[PDB]
């Protein structure tokens, strides 16, 4: 038993949060190209037999509410859980359309003690977002 | 037997801690581009950490930024796999 049991009736949910347009007052730019990402992910995880749900342009409040609600579903018949976040970010932070969300706040909903129907099951968070402002100059080989 | 409440999470970050992450306005982000391609090619073949390692290599090797701004030109990216998983993960049973 060195591998996760992945033959439950369902592979599980794939939640894709695609934030493209941000409230003007935040001063955050539109993330051109992100719809290409969201579409690619939808197809890719569809072919892996995940129940994909795409959500676009969520406020910070909507992100937290969505995550809370999803973590309170019954995942007993699901092998795993996947969440993809596409947004602006900083270290430890993802942006809703109107301001930031702590990544810890989101993932805490799925803690082994807080989401019992996912205890012992792989919980995957895939994050396309900045983690700061450093640039990698690279090295020729 | 208890398990840690933080066990069995995997965080697939597009970029290293402290760094920008790159997105192309036409093609999509370097990371998601690469992730989908490697999942399509290897999900029926490789364990998930090994798939993500192929993603690391693809982003690291095949992408480099182009900018009229010298500050942002010719830059590279490495994704960052963060695993608190306790077992191997195969998408096929």
């Amino acid at each position: 038993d060195n591998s996760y049991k992945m033959d439950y009736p369902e592979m599980g949910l794939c939640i894709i949060i695609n934030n493209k347009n941000f409230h003007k007052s935040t001063g955050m730019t539109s993330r051109s190209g992100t719809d290409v990402d969201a579409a690619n992910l939808r197809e890719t995880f569809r072919n892996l037999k995940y129940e994909v749900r795409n959500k676009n342009d969520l406020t910070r409040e909507e992100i937290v509410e969505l995550m809370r609600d999803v973590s309170k579903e019954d995942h007993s018949k699901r092998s795993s859980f996947v969440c993809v976040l596409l947004s602006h970010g900083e270290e430890g932070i993802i942006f809703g359309t109107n301001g930031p969300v702590d990544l810890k706040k989101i993932t805490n909903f799925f803690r082994g003690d807080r989401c019992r129907s996912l205890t012992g099951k792989p919980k995957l968070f895939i994050i396309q977002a900045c983690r700061g402002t450093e640039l990698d100059c690279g090295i020729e080989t | 037997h208890k398990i840690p409440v933080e066990a069995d999470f995997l965080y697939a970050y597009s970029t290293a801690p402290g760094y920008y992450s790159w997105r192309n306005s036409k093609d999509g982000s370097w990371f998601i581009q690469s992730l989908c391609a490697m999942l399509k090619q290897y999900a029926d073949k490789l364990e998930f950490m090994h798939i993500l390692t192929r993603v690391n290599r693809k982003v690291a090797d095949e992408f480099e930024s182009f900018s009229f701004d010298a500050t942002f030109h010719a830059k590279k990216q490495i994704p960052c796999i963060v695993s608190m998983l306790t077992k191997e993960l195969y998408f096929y049973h």
Binding site: S32, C130 | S21, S25, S65
Partner: peptide, 4 residues
Amino acid sequence: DEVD
């Protein structure tokens, strides 16, 4: 190319 843009950054996030």
